[PDB]
Amino acid sequence: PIATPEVYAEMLGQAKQNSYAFPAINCTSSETVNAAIKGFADAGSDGIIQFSTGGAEFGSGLGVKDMVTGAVALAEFTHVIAAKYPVNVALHTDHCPKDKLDSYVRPLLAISAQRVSKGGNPLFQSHMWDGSAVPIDENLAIAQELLKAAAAAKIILEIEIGVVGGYTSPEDFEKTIEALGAGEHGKYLLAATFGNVHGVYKPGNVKLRPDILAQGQQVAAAKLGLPADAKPFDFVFHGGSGSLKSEIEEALRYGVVKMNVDTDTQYAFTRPIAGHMFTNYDGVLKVDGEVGVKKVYDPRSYLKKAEASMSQRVVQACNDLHCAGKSLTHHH
Amino acid sequence: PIATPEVYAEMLGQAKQNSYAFPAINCTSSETVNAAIKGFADAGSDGIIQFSTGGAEFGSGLGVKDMVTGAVALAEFTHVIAAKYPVNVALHTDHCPKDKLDSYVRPLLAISAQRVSKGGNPLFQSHMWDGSAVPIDENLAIAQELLKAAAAAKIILEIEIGVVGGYTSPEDFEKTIEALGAGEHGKYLLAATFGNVHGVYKPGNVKLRPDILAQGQQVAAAKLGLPADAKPFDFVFHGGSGSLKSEIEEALRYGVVKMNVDTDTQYAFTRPIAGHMFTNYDGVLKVDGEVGVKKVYDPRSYLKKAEASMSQRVVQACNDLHCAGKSLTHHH
Amino acid sequence: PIATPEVYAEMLGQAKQNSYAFPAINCTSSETVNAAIKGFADAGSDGIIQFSTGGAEFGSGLGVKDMVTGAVALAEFTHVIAAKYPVNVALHTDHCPKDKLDSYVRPLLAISAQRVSKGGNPLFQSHMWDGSAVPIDENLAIAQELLKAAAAAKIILEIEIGVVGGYTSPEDFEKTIEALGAGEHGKYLLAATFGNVHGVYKPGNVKLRPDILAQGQQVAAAKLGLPADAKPFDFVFHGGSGSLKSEIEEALRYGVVKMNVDTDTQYAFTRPIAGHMFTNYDGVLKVDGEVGVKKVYDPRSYLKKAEASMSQRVVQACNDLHCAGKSLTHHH
Amino acid sequence: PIATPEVYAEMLGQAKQNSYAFPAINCTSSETVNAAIKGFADAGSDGIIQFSTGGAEFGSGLGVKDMVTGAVALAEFTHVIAAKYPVNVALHTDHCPKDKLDSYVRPLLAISAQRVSKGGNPLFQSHMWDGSAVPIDENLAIAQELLKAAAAAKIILEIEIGVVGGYTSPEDFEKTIEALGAGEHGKYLLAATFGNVHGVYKPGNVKLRPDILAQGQQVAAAKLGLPADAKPFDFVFHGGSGSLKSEIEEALRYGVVKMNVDTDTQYAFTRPIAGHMFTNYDGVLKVDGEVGVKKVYDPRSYLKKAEASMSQRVVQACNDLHCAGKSLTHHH
């Protein structure tokens, strides 16, 4: 099913308590949503499907190019699909900067607030406010008001401090606890930067500093008067693709509950499509006066392979993050 | 917008009256739906999006493989998208044989009946019952009961007499009018076979006999006591891909209001994907120890091109069928 | 065997007498030479292998880029190969303009003159002087001196009047007979231009005017005091690829004895190489950390297919030109 | 130039004395010969071009399939080309088993014996007798008679003890010295097996035991009454492709003077051809009614790239084997 707000909160609480995390898979289409959910289900795992501003625009089609439309359309699709799987699937929106709040996160929050006012649940279960490009005080001012609105709509807010490549300071960690508390005013997720980078580069290139996350937890624990081993933050690991297994493991120890994956699932989706086009070149092209071969230019022929391959990469993510076999539905 | 039942009936009435037809484009995904609707809009045309049993299964994902789920999920997606376009978009389900009625058309009819009972409109605006594999009397017995159910849910029924390749007889035309009337008991569309073939073959191979359709109209007109030039049937032209322009023109003269297209839009969708994989071979594959190029293995990079190409083929269909520039929204 | 000068003269005499012609296939390598000769043999035909200035440069390798070296190296290769086939194979050099005479045709003539001085036969059996870019009188002045040198080395000279696309005038035909005679001072071949074009374009684009050739023969016949149906010129048809069968047939009627083919045999050679790379993409590339598949990146694996395909196109040329089954070895 | 027998003997003597070796590059065509020689020249190195039985058959064309013809034709080509480069190029034939001696090595020896009888030099400068599939005594009996014939024709014989994958024993090393001496009855090259394997596999898979070669030299030195550090054998390293740099270095220390390379130069040749076909897919194929693009289906367009790439891999071999910059022409 789609994760209810209560189930999603329980998911994130259980992950933190047990030092595991969920994959948050960027999706752009019916096929990619289907691939992600099947991956979660094959791993016996709960999971998160997320739409970026560009993913939402793409989902709305070239004739519309509207983020809200694409996110709503893909979310409605996902609601129907997820009902047919035993695992819990949460819907999330990715990076939304200041100049897109009025045309992405705010209108989506309003849609969910209307649903909740009628006794229903929100359309999305979390939204990201990415204020990393503005000063920390402005970032957290906007975050505080969005957190109030989100919590009232039964939605978790993700925020970002520091810019992910394409480090978070002790004072920025302190300011975050001061402005937002530690969940008692509404749950929030913190994308803290620790040398992580969006994209996939050669092994060695990306140098992660998970000690930054350890330090952040210690800073928060001290502020809140908690024991030194407390983990008050629910961290989000952006730029998960291409990471070493050992790096993921270390991040889990310090309270990462959500690792975002896009690039690696993109490669997994595209890889069999490329293979299909090459091995069926004279079927997908009308060559030498011939009319091609419908069986292989039917988009389903290669998109099924794309789907299955992306699902396998999602299963790998669930095993890397130690959420495999832990779905809160306990269907086993 | 999505075509209301009233608008869809008006669409088909206007098409018949003016000797034009609408494309019915088989779709399987968010991208193909988006491509089809953008094509209709670019042509200033109303249009039909249809899901086959296999298309619906595909739309539900490999982890579900359920026709109803896929059709509902894709229909819900389409409802959100179509609201953002000025043209009218009708939703249809394609070939449903006897052994799939209980797991496709009937449950979908029930969903729409529930919507209509609450003062809303149906999810789909037409459904196909394909009884061509059973004797004509059984075909029309099932058709009569489905027509009653469909009309009560504000839905048009498509039926089929004769098997499309992969001819309809005067007596079968007569039996159809006798069993179903001529629209006064609910509108229905008739897929009569006249040498048409699903798929795309070399020019010349497919030999159409549109005189069969002319004869059918004359048979119906005589039965109903109408003038010899009356067109009591709303015909559906299956196997539209690969047809000569002149063949399409002749079919229009005899009351074809709906021409189904799948194979040609499949080729149009896939063609730029093939091209993308070849020209970006060392970006979509990790070759010689390199890590590929995200910008070109991002599925959106080639799927945008696929979408645009399929939309162009849909525009061509609207111009071939003479529905271009005739959308009943008259947005111009 | 390699055509002796006597056999080559007999070949061209028999072709003219019987209104057929030989293909002159541009070659660039051991594989293309092998493909051409096998094509002649499969057709039971004599034939001509020719090297352009660029083909010769290519044959010499990137480390040499010397026309004489490449032509000699490929000719020596061809002498060994042709001895193993029952058909007669003549060696020819293609377009040599004024500024390349000193570095292509003249040094090659000198090599053959040395061979002949020792009681042997020439290395090449014909050479082309292409003076079409200089005024006709200068063209024919150079031609006359080259004809003397060529005939003394038992070599046939090809000349060109008019520029082939990328028409020959009555006066230019007259001047040619006046300057060179009609074979009694040494045989020569005349590349007269008649709307022919190097390269392959869409059907219709190239508009041939074989009546120009008919007129040329009539002009020569009148000059020589021969009957009006005499064919004093041995014509060469440049730009043979892409021609209609009927166009080739008409050219034969007017004394074409040699039709040059390059572009169509290039396509035939490359076509299966392209196919091989696509269907074996993950064998010819080291992908995803794998080491490829030697069996398919071994150049012989695709070059055998290239060879066989080019040979088939050469067989087609022999049947188009009506030289198939007519080899002067009469091996049958 | 082509290596004279005297120069080739000096090459191998200098290599042994200075602990370096020459690449022996398998070639199959004019393009591959040109690529190999250009690689030697670019590295300022002497080198060896070799033809296998299959390479020779391929070189003769599908219409001939004769090893002697192909080897002679390619050798004659190579003689013309090599004269234009400052470095010394030796010609060699690769693996010839017992049942092919009468149709490969023996007839080639006879051709060279005839040349030498007339005061000239042999066509090839070395030939391989591969008797590894027969018992050692029979192998060396045939080797002794072939060595006499080869030496009389100014040709070096290569022999093989042990079968290369797809170890040489102290007694087999001893028997070799006993039967053939240490060069005083004619120079010979010894392909001793030491865990080497033809082909290219993943790193680690091939486990070389160069200590076998060290042991062989010690066994020979003891037999001949030489100091323990003497290197009486000139070793040949079959299966050179895919080897670690450090493995090559160790083999050099023990008297390898010739390392055979085929698979890696095959990959280098094919790799840009594959790339060319993919990036020019709509030029090398006639697609959607178009006629392709001659500029990219001209075989020279991709074969130049193939040549250059193979030459680069040959330069790498010369640097790996430490023969780069050491050509005995000292042209610098």
Ligand SMILES: O=C(COP(=O)(O)O)[C@@H](O)[C@H](O)[C@H](O)COP(=O)(O)O
């Ligand atoms: O952290 C993430 C994944 O990083 P990688 O897994 O790609 O390293 C996501 O949050 C990215 O920001 C997202 O893929 C960007 O999507 P786009 O704006 O292109 O639609």
Ligand SMILES: O=C(COP(=O)(O)O)[C@@H](O)[C@H](O)[C@H](O)COP(=O)(O)O
């Ligand atoms: O008439 C039609 C189009 O014919 P063509 O345009 O393809 O000739 C449709 O009704 C086809 O039956 C449909 O494409 C079959 O879809 P599938 O069962 O493969 O999902």
Ligand SMILES: O=C(COP(=O)(O)O)[C@@H](O)[C@H](O)[C@H](O)COP(=O)(O)O
């Ligand atoms: O007439 C000919 C063939 O014409 P097509 O058969 O190609 O139309 C030949 O003489 C051409 O001039 C020759 O292919 C040019 O070769 P290049 O200078 O590129 O090495």
Ligand SMILES: O=C(COP(=O)(O)O)[C@@H](O)[C@H](O)[C@H](O)COP(=O)(O)O
């Ligand atoms: O040692 C060699 C190279 O090994 P690799 O460099 O390929 O490992 C050669 O002697 C091989 O036996 C030769 O490539 C076989 O050629 P083929 O019989 O296929 O025409």
Ligand code: NA
């Ligand atoms: Na990353």
Ligand code: NA
């Ligand atoms: Na069709």
Ligand code: NA
């Ligand atoms: Na041409």
Ligand code: NA
């Ligand atoms: Na090897």
Ligand SMILES: [Zn+2]
């Ligand atoms: Zn991110």
Ligand SMILES: [Zn+2]
């Ligand atoms: Zn459990």
Ligand SMILES: [Zn+2]
């Ligand atoms: Zn159909």
Ligand SMILES: [Zn+2]
């Ligand atoms: Zn209007």
Ligand SMILES: [Zn+2]
């Ligand atoms: Zn030409």
Ligand SMILES: [Zn+2]
């Ligand atoms: Zn005969």
Ligand SMILES: [Zn+2]
């Ligand atoms: Zn070997």
Ligand SMILES: [Zn+2]
């Ligand atoms: Zn020196």
